[PDB]
Write a protein that binds this ligand. Structure first.
Ligand SMILES: CC(C)CCC[C@@H](C)[C@H]1CC[C@H]2[C@@H]3CC=C4C[C@@H](O)CC[C@]4(C)[C@H]3CC[C@]12C
Ligand SMILES: CC(C)CCC[C@@H](C)[C@H]1CC[C@H]2[C@@H]3CC=C4C[C@@H](O)CC[C@]4(C)[C@H]3CC[C@]12C
Ligand SMILES: CC(C)CCC[C@@H](C)[C@H]1CC[C@H]2[C@@H]3CC=C4C[C@@H](O)CC[C@]4(C)[C@H]3CC[C@]12C
Ligand SMILES: CC(C)CCC[C@@H](C)[C@H]1CC[C@H]2[C@@H]3CC=C4C[C@@H](O)CC[C@]4(C)[C@H]3CC[C@]12C
Ligand SMILES: CC(C)CCC[C@@H](C)[C@H]1CC[C@H]2[C@@H]3CC=C4C[C@@H](O)CC[C@]4(C)[C@H]3CC[C@]12C
Ligand SMILES: CC(C)CCC[C@@H](C)[C@H]1CC[C@H]2[C@@H]3CC=C4C[C@@H](O)CC[C@]4(C)[C@H]3CC[C@]12C
Ligand SMILES: CCCCCCCCCCCCCCCC(=O)O
Ligand SMILES: CCCCCCCCCCCCCCCC(=O)O
Ligand SMILES: CCCCCCCCCCCCCCCC(=O)O
Ligand SMILES: CCCCCCCCCCCCCCCC(=O)O
Lengths: 368, 227, 57, 126, 338, 32
């Protein structure tokens, strides 16, 4: 794209070139500069058609700007005014939409705000319940707590960025964008961590609780910060301009490609894990088996983020269009409600959690 | 003086904590098996090949196994068996064939299965003396069981080569007598894994291993609410 | 003659158990009340003790 | 004091029929699963049949399945066994046995080493 | 020969029953109408000892009300300082299964027993600075269910081969033997004067033994199922038993029968441990339904409930000065209730 | 690609591409 600052420089350069043409050049209309175009010697009584300029991104180049010169050697004035008459209809052939596409951005900005409000509220209760209770402490419920706190940090790193965007060199914008695309990376890494942990329990009987726990913690939180850091250093080394909101070029892949390759792997683990459950059903000896497999799959699809694979690999498309709006609505709905789903399915509906809550309530009633 | 004692006992506490944090890893790594079987059945050959209590310690594929043989005890099991609600698997050995020893084995398996403190343990089941069953086809099971005649060989259980179909029918009938007991209650907490073994066999150790992993896998799948 | 020896031992055990002193139920059960009454104050579970004396607080 | 008193028995002819009774005194009879055990002459104790607390669940040893009828009477506190189509191989001493624990499903009562919860026995000969 | 002996035994039993009914002049629940109620005993958890890996099976307070021994199935025997919650000693056992542990009245010795049929006595003196086996005892053929120190050199043991034994620790031999039971012998309790003791077995009978003579004196048959727990009343002239039938019973040594029965219609679970308080007015009973009921031992009403455990309460102990009550369960925790 | 990052880049490009258009709209209005 073209920045709003280059346009002014191009206009000044065009004006300077027109001035040089003025110096170089029964009485014709004199050449002139009307802050857009430089007009040649106007033949008396005839319209002058000048092609639309090639230094304006938003103009249709092919068209012609009509301006009629009269028999007195001056440019025609607008009837009742002292302004110069001109027909620029041909130049402006691309005015299909101005603010119509903004509605799509407001729609999406509202549906992820609702999703990341519900997935913040229902995932603060979950971390309260898991942390508070003593007998819900396990290696499984440490990794679930890191997951839930990564969902929470994602949600608040969405709200912060949205607020600062609503309200360029100044560092507040760049820190906002950095923590946005850091907490996003750590969230996709922590669903990969849970993919690996659940895949490691089944296929390895022996296990080191502390070594694997701290290894997963480091792989979860630390490793995205290397990617983010490298992106920050590259961006600052080269472009280092405006906010870090605008895309630069290939540099955007520095954090895209190590995240996309945490979605293919996590999908492979999914089909691997589901496959062994079919075996586990078959080996215990119908419709009941199909129902149980269906239920286990549906209670395993929010965890590993299966939906991502539907639109994981797509090149950047046009701002408005079929594919883009289908993709973006689908993704914002499921990415937003994923938090709430992994709250309800795993913490609230867990048998052990319900048992603990019931026992605590029973003790409270008996004490009362 | 009041601070020295409260420093010495703090250091004693830290040393004991380090020792229990080096023993917890061992206790959590090693699996435990209870080799429970009748006297008539050959669990002696099994302890050889594969005081009051006897212990065998071995390892397969860098996995440690303690197997406990109940030795010189009393015939009343209802008290000491409550010490065994934390073992990873009960290996149960019966000899297919005087009294009706098979019925006694059925009653013992039923009591183990239905026991309140033994509802979360899985049973690995060996049907021993499979050669004597083959040798008995030309010279008892029908007399003690009125259901053996009204029984057909499973459409879904394949028979190994070189076996007289009458012997396969007797094998699968004996197996299904334990299976009806194990599938009766059907709580969905523990499973029964039946096998076959000869009087002299070597695959047995590999068998137990390939079932203990399965038990552990199912345990993790119970935690995630999947099974 | 082992089972009749065991029967004889049971008979002699019942003879030993029968020929004992038996105190009236109301008397021994009043002695228990006298004991529980006399040692009421010293009990630390019946009466809760202030935290300055109770070494677990 | 848990005490069990078998009643009935005697010398019978084959193909006949005979009833047994078990007077259960000194415990809450309604809450205990009970069963019959027999001792063949020169053999060990073998389980014959059983009956749950309510009387719904009944099971028999295979060799006598469909030939015996066990029934408990909680009204008068008595265990009642009917035996039809008697066989010469069914001669034994009969023991009315109780399961050690109340409100349970499992039992361990085949122990010849002085299991405390069975009656003195009755003689059945054919 | 057998008829004249069995009928004689039945006659003698009927004579004993008629003597008991003759001496039954009234009940404990009639002469205790004008007794004040113990109110609602609301006990609080003051400590929680967390060191064991497997389930805790038995425990025993020391005579100073300061140290306690806890035995787990992981092979560890841990000595706890009840005030500061510091572990003082951790001892690794030769076998994995332990069913009993006892802390000597002088604090010098710790004995433990299990399925191994060998009672190991450990000397805590340790001038070297490490625990060591003082002497292991191997004279039983079943399993070692319960053991108790009379003093430094004598220890009473209960086995699962229907017999009890009295040992001499210095020689390592059995001084005498106690043979009267017809089932597994679960637990025993020593009188304060260490002269007599009781034994509860799996035949629903309790036997009162004379330590010095070597004979039993009394047989109490008031239960319907196996007796698990047995504990002397603090004056040494009565004791309470806890069976699997879900009822507790209070027996007397002079009335030679039961005085009172403790039962509640909402409780159908077995009893795993009982212990009286210091005065004797409260009776603590640990039940199978993951809590301990505080019974009023003279009114047969529940004073309160200790609902702190998440698994089967296995052992219960009361200090010699009555200051605290420690309970151990199969969730591997020791709760010290105020 | 990642949907949230893609949306952020598309939105930023849209805003920067609409400021130039709104600035040039006034020039079209006044000159024409
Ligand atoms: C994991 C944590 C440590 C990552 C921290 C990232 C943030 C806080 C840091 C790392 C790099 C930093 C930026 C590096 C360079 C510049 C350019 C300078 O002219 C203004 C400050 C500014 C814009 C910094 C703002 C804050 C910044 C974005
Ligand atoms: C506050 C600004 C700079 C953002 C900071 C983000 C990072 C550095 C923070 C946010 C969440 C934090 C983690 C939260 C929880 C834990 C578990 C703890 O047992 C180890 C540290 C660890 C893993 C923290 C490490 C630091 C952490 C990853
Ligand atoms: C297994 C995982 C960790 C591999 C991750 C590989 C990533 C870090 C690699 C693979 C492809 C690489 C990109 C390939 C091409 C370019 C264009 C260049 O002008 C800027 C760097 C950039 C954008 C590279 C940055 C680093 C990069 C994104
Ligand atoms: C593994 C299964 C379940 C899902 C497979 C998803 C992948 C392989 C499929 C589904 C939708 C497909 C995309 C559909 C549309 C486009 C736009 C086109 O201009 C480039 C190819 C591209 C981007 C396709 C690439 C492959 C694609 C992403
Ligand atoms: C590490 C293993 C298991 C998985 C590797 C996955 C990565 C490296 C591969 C697989 C699919 C690839 C994507 C497929 C399609 C496109 C669209 C293209 O216009 C830009 C590159 C992009 C976005 C690719 C980037 C790299 C990619 C994400
Ligand atoms: C729960 C999930 C599956 C819901 C996903 C809903 C998506 C797929 C639906 C809901 C709203 C739909 C859009 C409604 C309006 C338009 C405008 C039209 O000019 C292009 C299609 C488009 C953009 C539709 C495409 C599909 C759409 C985005
Ligand atoms: C969840 C942690 C995220 C924390 C992100 C930090 C946000 C800092 C925002 C600072 C805004 C400063 C605005 C500068 C003025 C301007 O925009 O020109
Ligand atoms: C463990 C994985 C670590 C991944 C590290 C990725 C490092 C990427 C570095 C890219 C350097 C790009 C610099 C561009 C220089 C230029 O051409 O101007
Ligand atoms: C972007 C693609 C990268 C793929 C990342 C997955 C690579 C495997 C990393 C697993 C680390 C697990 C550490 C376990 C503990 C340890 O062995 O140290
Ligand atoms: C959003 C789309 C998700 C698609 C998910 C596909 C899941 C495939 C599961 C395959 C299970 C096949 C098991 C067959 C029986 C077996 O091999 O044990």
């Amino acid at each position: 794209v073209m920045t709003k600052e280059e346009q002014i420089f191009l206009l000044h350069r065009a004006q300077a070139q027109c001035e040089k043409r003025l110096k170089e050049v029964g009485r014709p209309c004199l050449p002139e500069w009307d802050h857009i175009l430089c007009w040649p010697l106007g033949a008396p009584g005839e319209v002058v058609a000048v092609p639309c300029p090639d230094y304006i991104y938003d103009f249709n180049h092919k068209g012609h700007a009509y301006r009629r010169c009269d028999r007195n050697g001056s440019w025609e004035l607008v009837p009742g005014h002292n302004r110069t008459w001109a027909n620029y209809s041909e130049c402006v052939k691309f005015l299909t939409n101005e603010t119509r596409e903004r509605e799509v951005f407001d729609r999406l900005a509202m549906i992820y705000t609702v999703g990341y409000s519900v997935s913040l509220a229902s995932l603060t209760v979950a971390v309260l319940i898991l942390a508070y209770f003593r007998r819900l402490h396990c290696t499984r419920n440490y990794i679930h707590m890191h997951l839930f706190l990564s969902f929470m940090l994602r949600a608040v790193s969405i709200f912060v960025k949205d607020a600062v965007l609503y309200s360029a060199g100044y560092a507040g914008c760049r820190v906002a964008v950095t923590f946005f695309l850091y907490f996003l990376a750590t969230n996709y890494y922590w669903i990969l961590v849970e993919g690996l942990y659940l895949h490691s329990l089944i296929f390895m009987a022996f296990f080191s609780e502390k070594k694997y726990l701290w290894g997963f913690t480091v792989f979860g939180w630390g490793l995205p910060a290397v990617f983010v850091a490298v992106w920050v250093s590259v961006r600052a080394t080269l472009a280092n301009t405006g906010c870090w909101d605008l895309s630069s070029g290939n540099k955007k892949w520095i954090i895209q490609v190590p995240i996309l390759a945490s979605i293919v792997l996590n999908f492979i683990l999914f089909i691997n894990i589901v496959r062994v459950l079919a075996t586990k059903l078959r080996e215990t000896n119908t419709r009941q088996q199909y129902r149980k497999l269906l239920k286990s799959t549906l209670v395993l699809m929010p965890l590993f983020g299966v939906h991502y694979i539907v639109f994981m690999a797509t090149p950047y498309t046009e701002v408005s269009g079929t594919l883009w709006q289908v993709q973006m609505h689908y993704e914002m709905l499921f990415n937003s409600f994923q938090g709430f789903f992994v709250a309800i399915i795993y913490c609230f509906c867990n048998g052990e959690v319900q048992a603990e809550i019931k026992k605590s309530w029973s003790r409270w009633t008996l004490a009362l | 003086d009041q601070r020295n004692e409260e420093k010495a006992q703090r250091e004693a506490n830290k040393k004991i904590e380090k020792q229990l944090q080096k023993d917890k890893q061992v206790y959590r790594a090693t699996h435990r098996l209870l080799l429970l079987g009748a006297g008539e059945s050959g669990k002696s050959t099994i302890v050889k090949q594969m005081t009051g209590i006897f212990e065998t310690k071995f390892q397969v594929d860098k996995v440690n196994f303690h197997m406990f043989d109940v030795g010189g005890q009393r015939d009343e099991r209802r008290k000491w068996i409550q010490c065994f609600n934390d073992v990873t698997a009960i290996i149960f050995v019966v000899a297919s064939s005087q009294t009706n020893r098979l019925q006694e084995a059925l009653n013992l398996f039923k009591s183990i299965w239905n026991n309140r403190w033994l509802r979360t343990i899985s049973v690995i089941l060996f049907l021993n003396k499979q050669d004597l069953l083959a040798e008995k086809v030309l010279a008892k099971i029908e007399d003690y069981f009125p259901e053996f005649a009204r029984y057909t060989t499973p459409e879904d259980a394949t028979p190994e080569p070189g076996e007289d179909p009458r012997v396969t029918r007797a094998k699968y009938f004996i197996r299904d007598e334990f299976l009806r007991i194990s599938t009766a209650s059907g709580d969905g907490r523990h499973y029964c894994y039946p096998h076959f073994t000869c009087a002299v066999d070597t695959e047995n150790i590999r068998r137990v291993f390939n079932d203990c992993r399965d038990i552990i896998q199912r345990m993790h799948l119970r935690q995630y609410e999947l099974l | 003659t082992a089972s009749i020896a065991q029967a004889r031992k049971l008979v002699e055990q019942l003879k030993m158990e029968a020929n004992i002193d038996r105190i009236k139920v109301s008397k021994a059960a009043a002695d228990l009340m006298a004991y529980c009454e006399a040692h009421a104050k010293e009990d630390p579970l019946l009466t809760p003790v202030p935290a300055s004396e109770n070494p677990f607080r | 004091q848990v005490q069990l008193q078998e009643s009935g028995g005697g010398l019978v002819q084959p193909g006949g029929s005979l009833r047994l009774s078990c007077a259960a005194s000194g415990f809450t009879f309604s809450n205990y699963k009970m069963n019959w055990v027999r001792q063949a002459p020169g053999k060990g104790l073998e389980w014959v049949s059983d009956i749950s607390q309510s009387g719904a669940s009944i099971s028999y040893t295979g060799s006598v399945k469909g030939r015996f009828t066990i029934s408990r009477d909680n009204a008068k506190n008595t265990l009642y066994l009917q035996m039809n189509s008697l066989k010469p191989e069914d001669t034994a001493v009969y023991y009315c046995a109780r399961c050690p624990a109340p409100f349970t499903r499992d039992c361990f009562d085949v122990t010849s080493t002085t299991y405390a919860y069975r009656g003195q026995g009755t003689q059945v000969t054919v | 020969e057998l008829d004249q002996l069995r009928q004689e035994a039945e006659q003698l039993k009927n004579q004993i029953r008629d003597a008991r009914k003759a001496c039954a002049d009234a009940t404990l629940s009639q002469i205790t109408n004008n007794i004040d109620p113990v109110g609602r005993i609301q006990m609080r958890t003051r400590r929680t000892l967390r060191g064991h890996l497997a389930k805790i099976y038995a425990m025993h307070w020391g005579t100073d009300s300061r140290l306690l021994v806890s035995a787990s199935q992981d092979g560890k025997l841990i000595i706890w300082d009840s005030y500061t919650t510091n572990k003082v000693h951790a001892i690794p056992l030769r076998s994995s299964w332990v069913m009993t542990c006892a802390y000597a009245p002088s604090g010098n010795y710790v004995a433990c027993g299990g399925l191994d049929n060998i009672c190991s006595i450990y000397n805590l003196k340790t001038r070297e600075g490490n625990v060591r086996v003082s002497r292991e005892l191997a004279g039983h053929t079943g399993y070692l269910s319960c053991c108790r120190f009379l003093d430094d050199n004598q220890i009473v043991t209960s086995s699962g081969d229907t017999t009890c034994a009295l040992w001499d620790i210095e020689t390592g031999q059995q001084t005498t033997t106690f043979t009267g039971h017809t089932g597994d012998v679960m637990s025993l309790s020593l009188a304060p004067d260490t002269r007599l003791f009781v034994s509860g077995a799996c035949d629903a009978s309790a036997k009162l033994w004379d330590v010095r003579e070597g004979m039993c004196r009394q047989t109490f048959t008031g239960h319907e199922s196996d007796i698990n727990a047995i504990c002397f009343f603090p004056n040494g002239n009565a004791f309470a038993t806890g069976s699997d039938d879900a009822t507790c019973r209070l027996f007397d040594l002079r009335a030679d029968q039961e005085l009172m029965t403790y039962s509640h219609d909402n409780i159908i679970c077995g009893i795993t441990s009982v212990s009286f308080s210091k005065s004797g007015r409260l009776l603590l009973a640990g039940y199978d339904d993951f809590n301990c009921n505080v019974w009023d031992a003279l009114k047969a009403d529940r004073a309160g409930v200790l609902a702190g455990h998440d698994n089967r309460v296995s052992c219960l102990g009361v200090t010699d000065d009555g200051m605290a009550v420690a309970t151990g369960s199969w969730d591997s925790f020791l709760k010290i209730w105020n | 690609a990642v949907a949230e990052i893609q949306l952020m880049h598309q939105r930023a490009k849209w805003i920067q591409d609409a400021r130039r258009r709104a600035f040039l709209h006034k020039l079209i209005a006044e000159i024409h």
